[PDB]
């Protein structure tokens, strides 16, 4: 049974540096007044912060992040949560450095409902470099789905108000579970899309604190000092010539709150990347991030795929999760066995193709919501904020980028202003 949805969704984009997190939280609830002070403000159904939302990022060791964890269910992160759920009645999604009773650390993302009930807490899986400076553990579940109830979101097909409810299954992936494992893996495992698809997620969430590729990453340039000298030059420069201070832009917020203007397709260029244009969304990200959830991507090659049979052996081999994974440390051929092929491995997919089907989420509606943080840390890592809402449309009839018309781009904040955009999305799923 088609069944069509309604939700409006609010992102919210910061610039948190590390020991401003009273400063941060003033400045959220600054946005959030503006936003309901908008001229087209609808009430959002769903909230979503970016990675340490109130934080900041680059923590150099387990002493310096220390004094801003938190359990799952109390500090500043769940607080401001709770309030801001409590207010708008509705889901709010924060990322938080996290420490549980054992005192193991995460990079963590917590879900409160609209009672204000904390429903959720996700652990990031593939962790970036920095995470390694302060003991940052893995999450042992690996990848994960949840449902989240939503009051008076959907109708059927030919009623004319939204008036029924909708359990929808949500995935939180949080930035570098976008990426191949330790960026070492095969690009085209593309683990953690190819997971929402396997699973039919229908929401997809990303808390984030992704890079622009001006950034200073280059290791041999990192651990020399007179390159990293030189480098470091390179960036106070760009922030200098566009009118801001090194650590970026704060406190002068970009609404795109309840528009319909949609983000302009273009192909990545040899200018895509540059920090420039703070009102403008990173073109270079925005599509390297298309390409990351191909999976959900219309692809004509996947007929010739099929009909040859060239990843059953890929879809039938690929694991849950890397075998190196935490996942596995303590968890764990159907082609030479007698075990019956389970409902589970008809899931499946490779590059977006499934035992079945050439292209398992054809037809099929999903929405990804990315909040991705701004600004510039260390004097040497620019975030690429560009927030936004896009959805995957399931629709046939190839390119890579922003130009596949399966993908809807349906609003971005700029690369380099805190702020916040909704948008009211519209989308189907089955039950």
Known sequence: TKLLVSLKVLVIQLNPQIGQVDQTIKRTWSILDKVTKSATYVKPDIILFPE????????????????????????????????????????????????????????????????????????????????MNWDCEENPEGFQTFPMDFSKCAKLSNEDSYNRDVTLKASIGISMDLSPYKFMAPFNHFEFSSFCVDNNV?????????????????????????????????????????????????????????????????????????????????????????????????????????????????????????????????????????????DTVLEKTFLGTSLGQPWKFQGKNAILVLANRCGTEDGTTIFAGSSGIYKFNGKKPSSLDSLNESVELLGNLGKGLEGAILREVQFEVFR
């Open 202 to 342: 229908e929401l997809i969430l990303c808390p984030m604190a992704w890079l622009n590729s001006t950034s200073i990453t280059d290791k041999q340039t990192l651990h020399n000092n007179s390159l990293l000298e030189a480098a470091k030059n390179k960036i106070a420069f760009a922030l200098k010539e566009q009118g801001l201070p090194l650590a970026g832009s704060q406190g002068i917020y970009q609404l795109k709150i309840g528009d319909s203007q949609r983000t302009p397709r273009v192909p990545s260029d040899d200018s895509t990347s540059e920090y420039k244009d703070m009102d403008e969304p990173d073109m270079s990200n925005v599509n390297y991030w298309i390409l990351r959830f191909f999976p959900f991507l219309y692809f004509k090659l996947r007929i010739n795929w099929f009909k040859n049979s060239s990843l059953i052996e890929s879809i039938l081999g690929k694991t849950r999760m890397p075998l190196d994974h935490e996942y596995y440390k303590d968890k764990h051929d159907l082609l030479d066995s007698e075990e019956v092929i389970k």
């Open 52 to 131: 340490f939302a109130l934080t900041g990022y680059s923590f150099h060791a387990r002493k310096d992040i220390l004094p801003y964890v938190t359990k799952k269910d109390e500090g500043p992160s769940f607080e401001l949560a709770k309030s801001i759920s409590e207010k708008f009645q509705c889901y709010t999604i924060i990322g938080y450095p996290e420490e549980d009773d054992e005192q193991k650390l995460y990079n963590s993302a917590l879900v409160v409902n609209p009672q204000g009930g904390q429903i959720f807490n996700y652990r990031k899986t593939f962790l970036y470099d920095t995470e």
